[PDB]
RNA sequence: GCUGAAAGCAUCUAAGCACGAAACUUGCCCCGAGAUGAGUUCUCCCUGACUCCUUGAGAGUCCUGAAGGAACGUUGAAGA
RNA sequence: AUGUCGGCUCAUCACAUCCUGGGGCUGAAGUAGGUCCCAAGGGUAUGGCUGUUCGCCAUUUAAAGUGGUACGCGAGCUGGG
RNA sequence: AGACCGCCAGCUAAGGUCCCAAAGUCAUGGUUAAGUGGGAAACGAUGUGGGAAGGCCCAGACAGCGUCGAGUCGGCCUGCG
């Protein structure tokens, strides 16, 4: 509702394309496309998208609020793009990007090689840092979580793949 | 990948220089001749039909003779089909030799097991015998109880009982290919395979591998 | 995870949430507080 | 406890 | 003067074709069962099959309400001890979509020889094509 | 878990998306078209005359007897 | 007249899981545990004593699960009680 | 609801009217999303409908960070889950 009320601006160099329910947002960074819920009415109007409930649906407002938030992020995706940073804490823990493959070394007896999806690119500022870049906010989120899964931060020394801005609550081993 | 049809010649051993005796079944694999090719358009699946061996012309009925004639191959002792993988291709009339197995490390071998006739539960299902003595009355090798009581008041399907044993299709999987002698039409496989000496064997590259 | 008939907020940070027809308590700070009704 | 005696035989009678 | 009775040798049976696409399974099935039995004809006779032949196309696109698509379970027993098997509506549609309509209709037809005969007049196809042009089926909207 | 509103936040869930076990469906082995919903493919065989009747998927006579099958015999690591 | 304990033979189901599989929390450093959730595919001792079931004991095992089936099973055996 | 017998007539009772299986896929207005309906308790819970008050509120509240701009907060009774 309150999210759905606020219309999202369409900056210059951003081309919308409403095709019933299917939307397509094009820009400099990349191309994104989605299919909205059938209870969402979307209008281009004056170079600013606005959302509201189609009638005959009880969940119209809720569905509009999410549709708004998604399109808002599709806009920022094709312009600025999204960025996630992952630290590797732990002795001997290293990463290495090789095209669209991240070769991890996470204290296993075998090499971890995560194949990246379509519109994601990774970097290695240092050995113990990965920087993901992409248009889709959901996909970059997934990939980051996938990498974190390999070796989640443990609560005694905080060893493992963590997000840059993640508070890892540690605790002491029981006395005696 | 396709297989070949062969004949169980018998068992022997190969001595290795490093002083190991390998027990081998000797499988004679004559040329398998393609009699028919099945395709999706006509048959709905891809396969070859092959024949092997020979047959006296007077034992070949007219329906069978016509089938061999269309292919332009000599009558063999039977027909067997092999499903084709997507890459494979064959033509009617083509011979396939045991050279097929030149690079194959392990095979599955299918045959008809020896026939034991009507077998008891001790032999057929490894049931335990009851006491030989200590008062047992006429119930030394009999199967014991075959069910519960009023619930369920029946015997369940698949209950293990006396019956025909052997004389059925059996596959032994993942046998080592010890030797492939194209010139003698021989395949040596390590270990025993189903059937009596002289029986037909189907040999295929191992599915598990 | 504590599985109980009676699930409750134990602290202020505890949040009740229904997921897939099941009441849960989630607590960022204290994993001990994690509960599922069952 | 047992609710029946162990089976026993009957005396012979002229059968027909 | 006795009440009329249809005669198997003189009864006229027509061919119809129905599109299952987006139809609610149970509400389609009742209409099929009605027509297979011949309850829509004035010559309806309970011991005679007076019904019509019906082709059902696009069985794979039949609809169900609620969470039935994932939660409706089909059970069968193989007859071997422990041999209770099950499949969700979703699994059935993937493996054998025609069975879903056939099962729904069979359960709504009389049990016995006549009901089995009636069911033989239903021809269910997963897709949009059939091979009964020779029977010249008329389109039937259900 | 990701994205994400309802609820300006938060939230794995409502829309959407991703992982996830010897369980489930397959994959392996065997049976299997009486699967009466009785399926498919290949090959082989038969190309006479006449009469009658309540006229039809009718009956009868003569000629013809195929492909193949069965019987019989010698038998089998097949078998009561 | 619906033969009764235990043994033997042959089982079959439940899951409130003994092992193996997956997971959350831990007063979880590791190893090893505790506890709860999911899971029924398969597996799940041999002996001494006693009519025993059980139990105790010896020695194993990944484990020696708990129950239902006329306290499963004598027109299948035994007949110690 | 009390069968004296016959009828290939008609009207009703309880109970019913999508198909099995006779009769509404009847009408109008609500509720439920649980296949609840079609098995059960203490107790638990921002499920959702209705009703009556109250506190705060363009002298700028509640949420997020002095800033931003309209309804919101937490109990009561009650329907269905
Ligand atoms: K057939
Ligand atoms: K048992
Ligand atoms: K199990
Ligand atoms: K009893
Ligand atoms: K008995
Ligand atoms: K006996
Ligand atoms: K129900
Ligand atoms: Mg034999
Ligand atoms: Mg023994
Ligand atoms: Mg005696
Ligand atoms: Mg004896
Ligand atoms: Mg019964
Ligand atoms: Mg009936
Ligand atoms: Mg295993
Ligand atoms: Mg359980
Ligand atoms: Mg399995
Ligand atoms: Mg008993
Ligand atoms: Mg006896
Ligand atoms: Mg008995
Ligand atoms: Mg009336
Ligand atoms: Mg009716
Ligand atoms: Mg209506
Ligand atoms: Mg219910
Ligand atoms: Zn808490």
Swiss-Prot record, chain E:
Molecular function via GO: mRNA binding; structural constituent of ribosome
Gene3D superfamilies: Ribosomal protein L13
UniProt keyword list: Ribonucleoprotein, Ribosomal protein
InterPro entries in UniProt: Ribosomal_uL13, Ribosomal_uL13_bac-type, Ribosomal_uL13_CS, Ribosomal_uL13_sf
Alphabetical GO biological process terms: negative regulation of translation; translation
A Pfam family matched in the record: Ribosomal_L13
Stretches that traverse the bilayer: none
Keyword Chloroplast part of the UniProt annotation: no
UniProt keyword GTP-binding, yes or no: no
Any one Gene Ontology cellular component term annotated for this protein: cytosolic large ribosomal subunit
SUPFAM superfamilies: Ribosomal protein L13 (SSF52161)
Entry function: This protein is one of the early assembly proteins of the 50S ribosomal subunit, although it is not seen to bind rRNA by itself. It is important during the early stages of 50S assembly.
Protein family membership: Belongs to the universal ribosomal protein uL13 family.
Assembly, per entry: Part of the 50S ribosomal subunit.
Protein name: Large ribosomal subunit protein uL13
